[PDB]
Design a binder for this molecule. Structure first.
Ligand code: PC1
Ligand code: PC1
Ligand code: 3PE
Ligand code: NDP
Ligand code: SF4
Ligand code: SF4
Ligand code: SF4
Lengths: 155, 45, 318, 342, 145, 176
């Protein structure tokens, strides 16, 4: 029946989506250096069919990392809006998650969620490359448990 | 007891190398040009 | 019966072009001590299908300032000329036996710049327009070197008929007779296709996207497929002028695999070259061509145009 | 009011204001702004969600952590609504399908659910209800839009005695689907105008005022069965809207008079699409259903908010529709069209 | 001569994987076709392996169980599925597999390790665990004086 | 002491000029750049596959917090309050009241997990090492709320990660 047809099509689409997650790593601080340990020869980032990509026009997940100041805030939202559908932002590190140890500072916005709809919160200071890779795997499974075609079919 | 912290051995560690060890290799400038022109002459012939 | 051959020619290129991205990503990985895509299917073989249709199922935003007509025309003509470019290849029996096939090769290679120019202009972005005219000025500057080197090479062949190359290059590779022009030809190829070290037209950390700029699922994939269609073939042109193979008519398969392997090994070097070397600056990228290549190009053309007359070894044009 | 519900805080994101809103179907035009206003001063939103969470993602950065709660629900099952409003100081309804769907017709989204949530919310002992119904709600009206709202109007009236039914007229805003509508008639060749649109005046109101009305109606005592009506400050003629938008869109305009006989085919053909039916038969007939100027029903000023003029907020929505050719042209380039306001 | 034993390892890989079906299972589920000694097996089905010859990092590895605590897992490999006792040996924090040295017996230790529960009904939700302040008044029950 | 790094006189004989002329013409230092790239291709990659394998750590790792308890079973947290006075992000929050028997256990111990930096200071602060940082680092989430920890969630971490940290501290307290 039709329900099975859309379910298989839904499986196929998300298989691509949970495979070629070309990332906008928008890290700014010591969360940024530890992420390269996830683009490492030690833990390959390219091995899960995902390659660090410039030109935000072709990007799917935006890795936000490092402390987020007020000055950066206008620039972070504009690039997020330039990012195409689908777009997921993974908050990396204590600073980008809730503000972190730079919480009460006069020039830090507490957490990136106040500016962008975060999909995955990766805790850490810095989040070890394994931990942030685990978050990417967590986001990968999130794409798997997606029902885009089901909602349209059952609208 | 007695102190068993991380210590160097009483004989000391082994040698360490701090050099630009780029190795001289290949051929001589006359040789490369000569063998290069030889192949060209072979190709022409 | 003929649309057979067209489809039996076209679809393999698209499949070959697509799997070059895998081959590139994995080669580079092992080049800089990595494994590359290996989790999406066995040895990542299904990853090309994963990203390709992904680059067809992700939303294709049209920039507000972009002119739709040119933003659509540029990928179309960039892709169209690459596919038509493959028709005169003397692969055993060429599909199109144009007696002026080499001119046909260069005529279409001179129109990919329009795909570069319009896409840069159509995007109507400051970052695009400086990327465009710089990109186009690079590639048409290497046109003169590209044209002359061939003129030296086929001068010993007899004509511009591509199928005649197998007859001329029968006993020895033509590289053994024009190896000064060999790397001279080969190095100019990366300039045209814009591959590192001559990768000024992309610049992921400098030009961010280069002439591709604001391109996503849709027109971008064509550009990525177009750029990875020219790379596969400049091997075939190189593997035809330079190193070739015998063409025993009883076994055309013998020419196929032998030709295919050379066009595979050379594509590895193209991918291999991008790995090590730094990326050129524009001034030197033009300085190397106009000042360090052109005087060399002109001299070799004089040598290659007087050598057959000197040795009474002019080739038969028929 | 409960001790935990005591409103203290300077109207900030993490401030406590006591409004336990349960906005239904917030994944829409005014669901987007209502939570923003609800989340501006701090008020737990419990919004039912049924669609994919991704389309609900952009509602998350609208309040403090632990304020905007996403809860699964079903339109048919009563127990789903029972859980979403089991703890709700107020309940706000906006659910309504603007086109035709295979699984939902007009009434199923306009009489069943709005009344179903109405009775269960009273069953759940709610204290308010701000269900909405289009201000041109008439059974006698040919448009099944207005017929459905009117029967929905009485259904929530009897079910909830204190149902402060909301009567909003045409509403314009960033994704209003109306100002974007007349902008999109360019892609259908010459712009078709039924009877040229010589006899249709409508009252559009900027949504932020519409959203401001709902929250003000939430916090103002009054309510409890009122029938507030929401209209703009001025009304243009149907031509007069289309000339204004096309002027501020700077797009070429061909007002070709198109008889309603072909609107039946046009509305049907755009509906046959297995995707979003851009135009439906009820839409092709609601275009001339000119909004009235009823004075009896209370307006925005009754709540205490003034309706921004349409010509004041035009670029904000429509700068996207105009191309790069006139991207930097502001209000002063485009004068306001003929004002036939009452 | 050096080529034959390399292919011998390649064919031995299928032999150690329990046939072609087992080989394709690990090749797809785990994407790591390697034969290693069985060091131990925990209480969920997680099979642990060790290979001295492999370098540091590939020294010890694990192919996870197909089922644990309800979640069916065949294409759902995760890092939170490792029970705490094997979390030491697997991360190479100590050369002592739990099957050799078992954890010190305590009453309060969880008998079933849990995976990452985020995004599911049984996920975590924060709340204030203090009791209350400012106790309110209470009058007898009939209103207005 | 000092050492010059750039000064160098190129030899100016015919062989030397030919060497340099060949180097520019027949690219040899370029090919050397390619030469040791192949050596890197024909080498074992250091790619640790995940979650199947794990990059090595140490018995001192600082990660997810977990409040432990005595071998008899009673909470180690004394409400000594010191962890706050050292917490440089002020992430933790301790408030306690006399229990039913009278032994003070905190009525609220809410480490704001997206606030701390995993100092190890809170561990170094506790006189009864109640609060520790478990070896787990894979505790990402999708809602910002689940990061915000509390007393119960801390205790569950302590009861879940109990054998490991008991072993880690057992093998690391001597250094401490
Ligand atoms: C399986 C695949 C096996 C083969 C892999 C490729 C082998 C060749 C490339 C790697 C070479 C490694 C570097 C090396 O040999 O350096 C020593 C040598 C010498 O390097 P050098 O920089 O020490 O040279 C010093 C001597 N003077 C100063 C005179 C230059 O490398 C070479 O000689 C490279 C010559 C390259 C010639 C390129 C132009 C002709 C191309 C013809 C078509 C091919
Ligand atoms: C009887 C004999 C008649 C003929 C004899 C001809 C003369 C003898 C042979 C001379 C050498 C051959 C001709 C010149 C070639 C070099 C041209 C040139 O300008 O070079 C210097 C140029 C310029 O060097 P430069 O700029 O440092 O110095 C030149 C002088 N100034 C400074 C004034 C400009 O440099 C290069 O070409 C460097 C490499 C650029 C491209 C980067 C990628 C290289 C990839 C190499 C590996 C792959 C090789 C593949 C080979 C083909 C395989 C099929
Ligand atoms: C065997 C018999 C012949 C042996 C060789 C004889 C000729 C030797 C010529 C030596 C080079 C010329 C003189 C010289 O040193 O010129 C250097 C100069 C460098 O210019 P540039 O690199 O831009 O740097 C400028 C700022 N310093 O140069 C310049 O600025 C000018 C460069 C001009 C290049 C012209 C190239 C023309 C095409 C190639 C030559 C074709 C044949 C011409 C006829 C030859 C007849 C013998
Ligand atoms: N300018 C305006 O906004 C005007 C609005 N109105 C009325 O006000 C309301 C506008 O709501 P708005 O959000 O802007 O509408 P939308 O155009 O966004 O679509 C309807 C909204 O309700 C949801 N919805 C639709 N059908 C159902 C259903 N069967 N069950 C549950 N949820 C459903 C939609 O989400 P999803 O698609 O995922 O179900 C969406 O949030 C409607 O009642 C409409 O008739 C009237 C005149 C003008
Ligand atoms: S969260 Fe920690 S590691 Fe990341 S930027 Fe902030 S202080 Fe640095
Ligand atoms: S965790 Fe330790 S230091 Fe902190 S309050 Fe409890 S007993 Fe005191
Ligand atoms: S380790 Fe973390 S929770 Fe403990 S004191 Fe340091 S910052 Fe605070």
């Amino acid at each position: 029946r039709g329900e099975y047809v859309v379910a298989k099509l839904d499986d196929l689409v998300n298989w691509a989506r949970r495979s070629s997650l070309w990332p906008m790593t928008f890290g700014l601080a010591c969360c940024a250096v530890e992420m390269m340990h996830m683009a490492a020869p030690r833990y390959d980032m390219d091995r899960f069919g995902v390659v660090f990509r410039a030109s935000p026009r072709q990007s799917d997940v935006m890795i936000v990392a490092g402390t987020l100041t007020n000055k950066m805030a206008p620039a972070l939202r504009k690039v997020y809006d330039q990012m195409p559908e689908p777009r997921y932002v993974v908050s990396m590190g204590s600073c980008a998650n809730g503000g972190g140890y730079y919480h009460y500072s006069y020039s830090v916005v507490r957490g990136c969620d106040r500016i962008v709809p975060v999909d995955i919160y990766v805790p850490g200071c810095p989040p070890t490359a394994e931990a942030l890779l685990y978050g990417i795997l967590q986001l990968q499974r999130k794409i798997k448990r997606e029902k885009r075609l089901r909602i349209w079919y059952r609208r | 007891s007695k102190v068993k912290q991380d210590m160097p051995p009483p004989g000391g560690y082994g040698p360490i190398d701090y050099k630009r060890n780029l190795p001289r290799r290949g051929l001589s400038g006359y040789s490369m040009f000569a063998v290069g022109i030889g192949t060209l002459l072979f190709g022409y012939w | 019966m003929f649309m057979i051959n067209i489809l039996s020619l076209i679809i393999p290129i698209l499949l070959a072009v697509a799997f070059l991205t895998l081959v590139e990503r994995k080669v580079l990985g092992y080049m800089q001590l990595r494994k590359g895509p290996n989790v999406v299917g066995p040895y990542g073989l299904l990853q090309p299908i994963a990203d390709a249709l992904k680059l067809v199922t992700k939303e294709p935003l049209r920039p507000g300032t972009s002119s739709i007509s040119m933003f659509i025309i540029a990928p179309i003509l960039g892709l169209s000329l690459a596919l038509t470019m493959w028709v005169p290849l003397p692969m055993p029996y060429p599909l199109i036996n144009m007696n002026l096939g080499v001119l046909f090769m260069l005529a279409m290679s001179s129109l990919a710049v329009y795909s570069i120019l319009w896409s840069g202009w159509a995007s109507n972005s400051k970052y695009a327009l400086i990327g465009a005219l710089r990109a186009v000025a690079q590639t048409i500057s290497y046109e003169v070197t590209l044209a002359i080197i061939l003129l030296s090479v086929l001068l010993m062949n007899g004509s511009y008929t591509l199928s005649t190359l197998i007859t001329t290059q029968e006993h020895i590779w033509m590289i053994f007779t024009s190896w000064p022009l060999a790397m001279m030809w080969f190095i100019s190829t990366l300039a045209e296709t814009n591959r590192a070290p001559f990768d000024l037209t992309e610049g992921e950390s400098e030009l961010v996207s280069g002439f591709n700029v604001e391109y996503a699922a849709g027109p971008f994939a064509m550009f990525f497929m177009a750029e990875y269609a020219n790379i596969i073939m400049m091997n075939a042109f190189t593997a035809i002028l330079f190193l070739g193979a015998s063409h025993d008519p009883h076994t055309p398969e013998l020419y196929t695999i032998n030709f295919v392997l050379k066009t595979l090994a050379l594509t590895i070097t193209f991918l291999w070259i991008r790995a090590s070397y730094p990326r050129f600056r524009y001034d030197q990228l033009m300085h190397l061509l106009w000042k360090s290549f052109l005087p060399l190009t002109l001299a070799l053309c004089m040598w290659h145009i007087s050598l057959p007359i000197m040795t009474a070894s002019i080739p038969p044009q028929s | 009011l409960h001790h935990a519900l005591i409103p203290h805080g300077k109207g900030g994101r993490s401030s406590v204001s006591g409004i336990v809103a349960t906005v239904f179907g917030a994944t829409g035009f005014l669901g987007r702004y209502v939570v923003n206003h609800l989340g501006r001063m701090g008020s737990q939103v419990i919004v039912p969600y049924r669609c994919e969470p991704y389309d609900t993602m952009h509602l998350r950065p609208m309040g403090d952590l632990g304020q905007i709660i996403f809860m699964e629900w079903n339109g048919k099952d009563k127990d789903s609504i029972r859980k979403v409003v089991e703890h709700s100081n107020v309940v706000i309804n906006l659910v309504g399908r603007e086109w035709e769907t295979k699984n939902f017709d007009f009434e199923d989204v306009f009489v069943k659910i709005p009344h179903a949530i109405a009775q269960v919310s009273k069953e759940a002992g709610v204290e308010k209800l701000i269900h909405i119904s289009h201000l041109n709600a008439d059974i006698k009206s040919p448009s099944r839009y207005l017929r459905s709202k009117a029967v929905g109007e009485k259904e929530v009236r009897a079910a909830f005695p204190e149902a402060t039914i909301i009567k909003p007229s045409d509403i314009f805003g960033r994704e209003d689907r109306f100002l974007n509508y007349f902008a999109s008639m360019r892609w259908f060749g010459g712009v078709p105008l039924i009877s040229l649109g010589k006899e249709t005046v409508k009252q559009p109101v900027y949504i932020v005022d519409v959203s401001k009305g709902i929250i003000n109606a939430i916090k103002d005592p009054d309510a409890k069965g009122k029938t507030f009506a929401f209209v703009g400050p001025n009304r243009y003629l149907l031509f007069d809207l289309v000339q204004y938008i096309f002027a501020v869109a700077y797009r070429p305009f061909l007002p070709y008079p198109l008889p309603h006989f072909a609107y039946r085919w046009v509305g049907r053909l755009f509906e046959v699409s297995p995707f979003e039916p851009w135009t439906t038969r009820d839409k092709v007939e609601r275009v001339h259903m000119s909004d009235m100027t009823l004075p009896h029903l209370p307006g925005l000023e009754d709540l205490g908010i003034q309706a921004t003029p349409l010509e004041l907020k035009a670029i904000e929505v429509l700068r996207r529709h105009r191309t790069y050719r006139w991207l930097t042209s502001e209000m002063e380039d485009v004068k306001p069209a003929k004002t036939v306001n009452i | 001569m050096e080529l034959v034993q390399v292919l011998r390892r390649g064919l031995q890989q299928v032999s150690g994987h329990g046939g072609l079906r087992g080989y394709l299972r690990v090749l797809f589920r785990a994407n790591d076709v390697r034969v290693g000694t069985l060091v131990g097996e925990d209480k969920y089905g997680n099979k642990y392996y060790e290979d001295n010859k492999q370098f540091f990092g590939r020294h010890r590895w694990v192919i996870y169980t197909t089922e644990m605590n309800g979640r069916d897992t065949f294409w759902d490999v995760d890092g939170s599925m490792v029970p705490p006792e094997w979390h030491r040996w697997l991360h190479c924090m100590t050369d002592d597999p739990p099957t050799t040295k078992p954890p010190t017996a305590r009453k309060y230790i969880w008998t079933n390790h849990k995976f990452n529960v985020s995004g599911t009904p049984q996920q975590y939700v924060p709340y204030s665990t203090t009791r209350k302040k400012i106790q309110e008044w209470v009058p007898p029950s009939t209103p207005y004086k | 002491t000092y050492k010059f790094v750039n000064m160098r006189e190129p030899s100016m004989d015919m062989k030397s000029v030919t060497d340099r002329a060949a180097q520019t013409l027949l690219w040899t230092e370029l090919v050397r750049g390619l030469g040791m790239t192949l050596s890197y291709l024909f080498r074992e990659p250091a790619t640790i596959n995940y979650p199947f394998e794990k990059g090595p750590l140490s018995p001192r790792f600082r990660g997810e917090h977990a409040l432990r308890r005595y071998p008899s079973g009673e909470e180690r947290c004394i409400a000594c309050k010191l962890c706050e006075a050292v917490c440089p992000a002020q992430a933790i929050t301790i408030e306690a009241e006399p229990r039913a028997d009278g032994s003070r256990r905190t009525t609220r111990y809410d480490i704001d997990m997206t606030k701390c930096i995993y100092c190890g200071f809170c561990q170094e602060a506790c006189p009864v090492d109640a609060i520790v940082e478990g070896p787990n680092f894979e505790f990402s989430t999708e809602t910002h709320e689940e990061l915000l920890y509390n007393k119960e969630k801390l205790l569950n971490n302590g009861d879940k990660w109990e054998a490991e940290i008991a072993a880690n501290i057992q093998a690391d307290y001597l250094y401490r």
